[PDB]
Amino acid sequence: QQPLNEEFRPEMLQGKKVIVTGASKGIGREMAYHLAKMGAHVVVTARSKETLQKVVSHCLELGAASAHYIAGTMEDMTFAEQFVAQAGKLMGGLDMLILNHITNTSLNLFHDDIHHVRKSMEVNFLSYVVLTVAALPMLKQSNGSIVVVSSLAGKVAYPMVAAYSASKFALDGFFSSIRKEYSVSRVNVSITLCVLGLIDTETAMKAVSGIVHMQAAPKEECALEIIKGGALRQEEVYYDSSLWTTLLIRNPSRKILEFLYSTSYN
Amino acid sequence: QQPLNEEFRPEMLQGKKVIVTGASKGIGREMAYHLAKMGAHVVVTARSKETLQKVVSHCLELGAASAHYIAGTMEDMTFAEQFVAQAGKLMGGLDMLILNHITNTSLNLFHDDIHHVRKSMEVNFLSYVVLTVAALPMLKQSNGSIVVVSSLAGKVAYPMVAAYSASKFALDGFFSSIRKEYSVSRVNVSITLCVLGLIDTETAMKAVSGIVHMQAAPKEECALEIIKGGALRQEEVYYDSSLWTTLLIRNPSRKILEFLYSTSYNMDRF
Amino acid sequence: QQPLNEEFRPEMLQGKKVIVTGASKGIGREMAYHLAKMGAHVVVTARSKETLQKVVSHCLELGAASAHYIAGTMEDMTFAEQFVAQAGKLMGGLDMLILNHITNTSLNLFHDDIHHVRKSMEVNFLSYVVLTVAALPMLKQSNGSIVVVSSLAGKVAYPMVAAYSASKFALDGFFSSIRKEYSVSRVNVSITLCVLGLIDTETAMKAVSGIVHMQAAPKEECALEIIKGGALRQEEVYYDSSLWTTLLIRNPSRKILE
Amino acid sequence: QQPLNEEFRPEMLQGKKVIVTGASKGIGREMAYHLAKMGAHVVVTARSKETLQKVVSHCLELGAASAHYIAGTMEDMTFAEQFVAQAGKLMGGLDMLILNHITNTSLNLFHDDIHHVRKSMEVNFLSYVVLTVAALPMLKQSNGSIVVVSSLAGKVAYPMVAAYSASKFALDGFFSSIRKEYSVSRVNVSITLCVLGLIDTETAMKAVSGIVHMQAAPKEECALEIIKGGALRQEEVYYDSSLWTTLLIRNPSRKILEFLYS
Numbered sequence A: 001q002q003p004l005n006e007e008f009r010p011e012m013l014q015g016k017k018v019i020v021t022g023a024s025k026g027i028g029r030e031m032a033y034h035l036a037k038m039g040a041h042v043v044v045t046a047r048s049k050e051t052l053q054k055v056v057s058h059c060l061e062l063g064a065a066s067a068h069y070i071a072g073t074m075e076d077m078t079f080a081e082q083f084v085a086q087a088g089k090l091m092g093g094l095d096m097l098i099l100n101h102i103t104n105t106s107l108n109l110f111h112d113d114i115h116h117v118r119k120s121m122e123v124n125f126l127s128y129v130v131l132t133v134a135a136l137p138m139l140k141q142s143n144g145s146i147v148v149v150s151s152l153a154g155k156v157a158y159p160m161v162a163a164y165s166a167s168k169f170a171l172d173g174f175f176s177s178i179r180k181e182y183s184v185s186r187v188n189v190s191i192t193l194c195v196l197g198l199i200d201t202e203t204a205m206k207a208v209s210g211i212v213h214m215q216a217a218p219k220e221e222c223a224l225e226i227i228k229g230g231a232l233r234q235e236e237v238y239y240d241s242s243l244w245t246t247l248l249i250r251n252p253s254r255k256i257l258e259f260l261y262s263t264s265y266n
Numbered sequence B: 001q002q003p004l005n006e007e008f009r010p011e012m013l014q015g016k017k018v019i020v021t022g023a024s025k026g027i028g029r030e031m032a033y034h035l036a037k038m039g040a041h042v043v044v045t046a047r048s049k050e051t052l053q054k055v056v057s058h059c060l061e062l063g064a065a066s067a068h069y070i071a072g073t074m075e076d077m078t079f080a081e082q083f084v085a086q087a088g089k090l091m092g093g094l095d096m097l098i099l100n101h102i103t104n105t106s107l108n109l110f111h112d113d114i115h116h117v118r119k120s121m122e123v124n125f126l127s128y129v130v131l132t133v134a135a136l137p138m139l140k141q142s143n144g145s146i147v148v149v150s151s152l153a154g155k156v157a158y159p160m161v162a163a164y165s166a167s168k169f170a171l172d173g174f175f176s177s178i179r180k181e182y183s184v185s186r187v188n189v190s191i192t193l194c195v196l197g198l199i200d201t202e203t204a205m206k207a208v209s210g211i212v213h214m215q216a217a218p219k220e221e222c223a224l225e226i227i228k229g230g231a232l233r234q235e236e237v238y239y240d241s242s243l244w245t246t247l248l249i250r251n252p253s254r255k256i257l258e259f260l261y262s263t264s265y266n267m268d269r270f
Numbered sequence C: 001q002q003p004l005n006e007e008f009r010p011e012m013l014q015g016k017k018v019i020v021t022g023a024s025k026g027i028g029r030e031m032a033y034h035l036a037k038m039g040a041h042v043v044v045t046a047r048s049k050e051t052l053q054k055v056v057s058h059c060l061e062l063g064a065a066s067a068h069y070i071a072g073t074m075e076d077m078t079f080a081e082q083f084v085a086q087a088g089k090l091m092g093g094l095d096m097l098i099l100n101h102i103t104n105t106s107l108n109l110f111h112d113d114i115h116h117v118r119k120s121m122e123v124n125f126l127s128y129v130v131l132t133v134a135a136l137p138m139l140k141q142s143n144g145s146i147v148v149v150s151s152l153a154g155k156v157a158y159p160m161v162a163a164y165s166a167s168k169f170a171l172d173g174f175f176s177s178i179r180k181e182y183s184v185s186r187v188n189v190s191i192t193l194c195v196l197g198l199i200d201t202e203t204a205m206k207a208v209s210g211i212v213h214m215q216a217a218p219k220e221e222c223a224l225e226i227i228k229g230g231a232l233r234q235e236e237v238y239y240d241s242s243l244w245t246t247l248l249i250r251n252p253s254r255k256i257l258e
Numbered sequence D: 001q002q003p004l005n006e007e008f009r010p011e012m013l014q015g016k017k018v019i020v021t022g023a024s025k026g027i028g029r030e031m032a033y034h035l036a037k038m039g040a041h042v043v044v045t046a047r048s049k050e051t052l053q054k055v056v057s058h059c060l061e062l063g064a065a066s067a068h069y070i071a072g073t074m075e076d077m078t079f080a081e082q083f084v085a086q087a088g089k090l091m092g093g094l095d096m097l098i099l100n101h102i103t104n105t106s107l108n109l110f111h112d113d114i115h116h117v118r119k120s121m122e123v124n125f126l127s128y129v130v131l132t133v134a135a136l137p138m139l140k141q142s143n144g145s146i147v148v149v150s151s152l153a154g155k156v157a158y159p160m161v162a163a164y165s166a167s168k169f170a171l172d173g174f175f176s177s178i179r180k181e182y183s184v185s186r187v188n189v190s191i192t193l194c195v196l197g198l199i200d201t202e203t204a205m206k207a208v209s210g211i212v213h214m215q216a217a218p219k220e221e222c223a224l225e226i227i228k229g230g231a232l233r234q235e236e237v238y239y240d241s242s243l244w245t246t247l248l249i250r251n252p253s254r255k256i257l258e259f260l261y262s
């Protein structure tokens, strides 16, 4: 996909119909707040209505054109399928789909917890695919954008996050493949893979305390960069405190192997 | 993990107890056959007893210490877990677990077929975790190996294989992560990820279109390279018809970042 | 340095005062011609004046704002220094200094030939530094550009071209270093390093015939790319017929370290 | 080239005939002392006649098989070629040529110091090619090694060190190209390009005093690591206070293109 070769302006999100999953707290909540100041229409989701309501309250206050919430579990594919239709109904269409939610996880050595491995695949990966299917028709109509929020754990290998790593790796695998398919089918829907480092969210901070020690980037700026990358139709976003990360994490060998062997099949 | 700074010898496998999954045809059958010539104890699986039967008979003719099949679907996690116990009880241990099977896949544009995405994750990824879990106590005992058969599509993106790539990518993320865990937990179980290009299997050959077919590597040499790599406790195995593809498949950047972030944690909790 | 975040328009060169070295044949000549159709002011150089006269006369025909030549050898450091002032006098200033000349080289195993090492260093590197110094005050006034023509042999190691590789490597070491200095000194003169693969020029084609089996990119498209990089104030320009080259050539580790 | 698939042992240098340039002070002096401890024959050179004699007397005390000095400037290409001939006569051959000297450099922005650019190139790079040419016949006879001491400034770009960087970059371009040439023409002479970060030499410590810098690595260990690399026939040696710095130094892309073009 070709990104919009121009500078980001907040006016790009004005009146834009956006979905934010995992938006009751952390990066999701921060993304909804950014989209509210921009005068966008937001539909937010998580399981907890109480925390979701509070987010909506601040969204309307901040100046969202409209702000709504729908609670449910991304463990349930029916909910996922329905939420998109419901969200679409409320905004009267869809421009951007931000897939951000993840199953609750902890830094632990993997032993025998297949239930968790399965849950991670269903919530962190499978549900993103169901949400993409439900939203693709509306996105085609608006020449919209799919925004996939991933991690450095979905580009390189880390211990204590095997089930998580696997789910995030699958997002790259799937989404990077449909991006190639959208190019050939001439489907004008952009796909942004967001590769994030450690962010100062309540959840991350509690999980990493004592176990891991490294700088945690601000969630406010993290969210803006995810929205920026999405609006500019960038294939990939890299966000982290360190700057070796950013530069080293890109894979030119991968892009050759992809391109210099793309035009080698009819 | 730290590998074996020795050259491969066919006797490294003599009398070794190996499970070969998806071994009734293609690369699996070839691995079973190679292990048979090496005089290994072999247990093979697929869903089809008819085809598994032919592989077993040929394995004994080729010189295997022993050869047995157990039929079932890796769609079923109860079969997967039981299969390992039974296989290991039959051989009186396990030194090598070769995870090769996949669900039937073809080249197509993704078309809202969530079922195919879920099946790919269950058969190609989850069944692999179930097998590993089930087999680790035995592999810890013999200071054994886990061999995970992957694809170029499990490292780089390609159209027509979304569901398939997602499962292959998921194998890299999970097994590469657990490998790092085995190093800190001092678990002497090697993990090998095999990155394969186009191989001349009846399945791959029916799937692909055009002159691309003549750029396929032999299944027999491929099966041998996987065995070799696995025996030498190598982290990754690259096998392609092209030398330039094997050079582009490496990721020194990833390996550096993995080493840099290794110092960022205190393991003294688990 | 910060490059121009816009698309290349031939207009960027209209009435711009440009020096092109080694402009009698090959890529240098092709650059003189491109700047001519773009309506630039060109002052060309090489040793052969009869060949240069042809170049100047064709530059005027193509639409140059003005076209002149000053013949000499870049072996003569006095010439190099004086040529810049003379060129700058003829145009009444300088916008772009394109450094393209090289001493004649061949594909040969190294044994003994110190002469060719010293000659390559003086002509392919030392003269470039003398011309830079001499053109610096003019370029600082115009917030101009320095364009350095290098090769793959100046980024990676090849046999048969040791003396030439050494000079090209030196060019990277030199110009990349002072570029950093210009940024910290707020010197708004840009530096463009051009890394070129094999190009179908007469001289290179004879040099590699029956020695190196490789496809050659065209000199016309090559020269244009050099001008674009310079005009767009890019730090580096990569140009070769192979695309495996173009992507692997950048060095994130060097950037991190920098 | 094929590096030695061996573990470095000090015994590898016992009775070897080694040249060390820039051996009156710094890293070069430390390499002489290390080679002395290893029981090697050493021929040292730099301009400082009095200091070189003191180094030689120390080398003899440390256990060198033999130790000699030849004072002169590497600006003089005649001295460079005449130095190898004499060094060869003093030891009765040559097993390793350690090219370590540089002309004196300070951290300064570039203005119009073409004298410093030309001098840096003559001393830091040209005398190295000249020394190489003279030593090659003896090195071909012993299947010997050429050890070229470079810097991080000879791989990446830093301000204040323009003339130095170019000369260091030139060494890489030349020696790496002759390394390909020797590998194909079957010349069993190894070429080690050493890439050093900041080292605690008086010259460098004085040179960076007015700027904020990383921890300087110890000269004694650096010198030994230059010898192990050379002794082991390694193409490149990286030495720095930081592992991070050393991991970032390797260029796997160039290694690939190099292959692609061969």
Ligand SMILES: NC(=O)C1=CN([C@@H]2O[C@H](COP(=O)(O)OP(=O)(O)OC[C@H]3O[C@@H](n4cnc5c(N)ncnc54)[C@H](OP(=O)(O)O)[C@@H]3O)[C@@H](O)[C@H]2O)C=CC1
Pocket (backbone or CB within 6 Å): A021, A022, A023, A024, A025, A026, A027, A028, A045, A046, A047, A048, A051, A072, A073, A074, A075, A099, A100, A101, A102, A103, A104, A123, A149, A150, A151, A152, A196, A197, A198, A199, A200, A201, A202, A203, A204
């Ligand atoms: N924070 C960091 O350091 C990093 C974060 N990331 C990525 O950023 C994203 C957001 O992470 P972060 O902001 O830290 O996460 P948070 O834990 O702060 O928020 C997660 C959100 O997902 C919701 N959620 C949890 N379980 C479910 C479920 N079963 N169904 C639906 N919604 C659910 C939560 O609400 P509720 O519990 O109410 O359902 C919450 O709104 C993730 O994709 C993560 O992988 C990547 C790298 C680093």
Ligand SMILES: NC(=O)C1=CN([C@@H]2O[C@H](COP(=O)(O)OP(=O)(O)OC[C@H]3O[C@@H](n4cnc5c(N)ncnc54)[C@H](OP(=O)(O)O)[C@@H]3O)[C@@H](O)[C@H]2O)C=CC1
Pocket (backbone or CB within 6 Å): B021, B022, B023, B024, B025, B026, B027, B028, B045, B046, B047, B048, B051, B072, B073, B074, B075, B099, B100, B101, B102, B103, B104, B123, B149, B150, B151, B152, B196, B197, B198, B199, B200, B201, B202, B203, B204
């Ligand atoms: N051929 C190629 O070009 C490449 C192959 N690979 C990898 O090598 C492996 C084998 O590929 P290849 O030899 O080509 O494949 P084949 O199709 O020849 O073999 C697949 C095997 O898996 C078995 N199988 C199928 N479905 C199931 C199931 N539900 N449960 C258990 N076993 C099952 C099949 O037997 P049955 O139908 O009786 O169950 C058969 O033995 C895979 O991991 C593949 O991804 C990777 C890259 C390229």
Ligand SMILES: NC(=O)C1=CN([C@@H]2O[C@H](COP(=O)(O)OP(=O)(O)OC[C@H]3O[C@@H](n4cnc5c(N)ncnc54)[C@H](OP(=O)(O)O)[C@@H]3O)[C@@H](O)[C@H]2O)C=CC1
Pocket (backbone or CB within 6 Å): C021, C022, C023, C024, C025, C026, C027, C028, C045, C046, C047, C048, C049, C051, C072, C073, C074, C075, C099, C100, C101, C102, C103, C104, C123, C149, C150, C151, C152, C196, C197, C198, C199, C200, C201, C202, C203, C204
């Ligand atoms: N062609 C290729 O494949 C590649 C070319 N390059 C670079 O492109 C540049 C030009 O190459 P190309 O156009 O191919 O070469 P050409 O030999 O065709 O042109 C070289 C030019 O330099 C002039 N020149 C030669 N010697 C001297 C001298 N002693 N003093 C002054 N001028 C001199 C020549 O004219 P005269 O004899 O009249 O003085 C001629 O104008 C060089 O920097 C080269 O490294 C880089 C990579 C590959």
Ligand SMILES: NC(=O)C1=CN([C@@H]2O[C@H](COP(=O)(O)OP(=O)(O)OC[C@H]3O[C@@H](n4cnc5c(N)ncnc54)[C@H](OP(=O)(O)O)[C@@H]3O)[C@@H](O)[C@H]2O)C=CC1
Pocket (backbone or CB within 6 Å): D021, D022, D023, D024, D025, D026, D027, D028, D045, D046, D047, D048, D049, D051, D072, D073, D074, D075, D099, D100, D101, D102, D103, D104, D123, D149, D150, D151, D152, D195, D196, D197, D198, D199, D200, D201, D202, D203, D204
């Ligand atoms: N120190 C550091 O941080 C780093 C050092 N290096 C490399 O290590 C090498 C030496 O470093 P270092 O030991 O720090 O430098 P020093 O200044 O301590 O030593 C340089 C040596 O060269 C000699 N020398 C100076 N001028 C001449 C000349 N005209 N002709 C012949 N010999 C001369 C000096 O002795 P005398 O003055 O008596 O002639 C001296 O022994 C160089 O290759 C340098 O690039 C690379 C990276 C970092």
Ligand SMILES: O=C(N1CCC(c2cnc[nH]2)CC1)N1CCCc2ccccc21
Pocket (backbone or CB within 6 Å): A105, A151, A152, A153, A158, A161, A164, A196, A197, A198, A199, A201, A203, A204, A207, A208, A212
């Ligand atoms: O994204 C994470 N995680 C994994 C899951 C947890 C989480 C992520 N978002 C909310 N919780 C903790 C941090 N990463 C990626 C960036 C830093 C990190 C360092 C060590 C281990 C894991 C991680």
Ligand SMILES: O=C(N1CCC(c2cnc[nH]2)CC1)N1CCCc2ccccc21
Pocket (backbone or CB within 6 Å): B102, B105, B106, B151, B152, B153, B158, B159, B160, B161, B164, B196, B197, B198, B199, B201, B203, B204, B207, B208
């Ligand atoms: O691993 C594969 N596959 C994917 C699925 C098919 C398959 C894999 N195993 C048996 N059949 C064909 C080859 N790869 C690797 C090389 C050939 C190929 C060409 C296009 C897309 C993907 C792939």
Ligand SMILES: O=C(N1CCC(c2cnc[nH]2)CC1)N1CCCc2ccccc21
Pocket (backbone or CB within 6 Å): C102, C105, C106, C107, C151, C152, C153, C158, C160, C161, C164, C196, C197, C198, C201, C203, C204, C207, C208, C212
């Ligand atoms: O730049 C060159 N050269 C070296 C000098 C010669 C030359 C350059 N310009 C005129 N003649 C031939 C090409 N290179 C770099 C690009 C390809 C190449 C392949 C094999 C040998 C040398 C070279």
Ligand SMILES: O=C(N1CCC(c2cnc[nH]2)CC1)N1CCCc2ccccc21
Pocket (backbone or CB within 6 Å): D105, D106, D151, D152, D153, D158, D160, D161, D164, D196, D197, D198, D199, D201, D203, D204, D207, D208
């Ligand atoms: O080798 C150097 N230099 C350049 C020449 C000087 C020198 C080196 N050895 C003796 N003197 C000072 C430091 N280096 C290498 C270490 C890092 C560095 C960072 C910024 C500038 C220069 C340098």
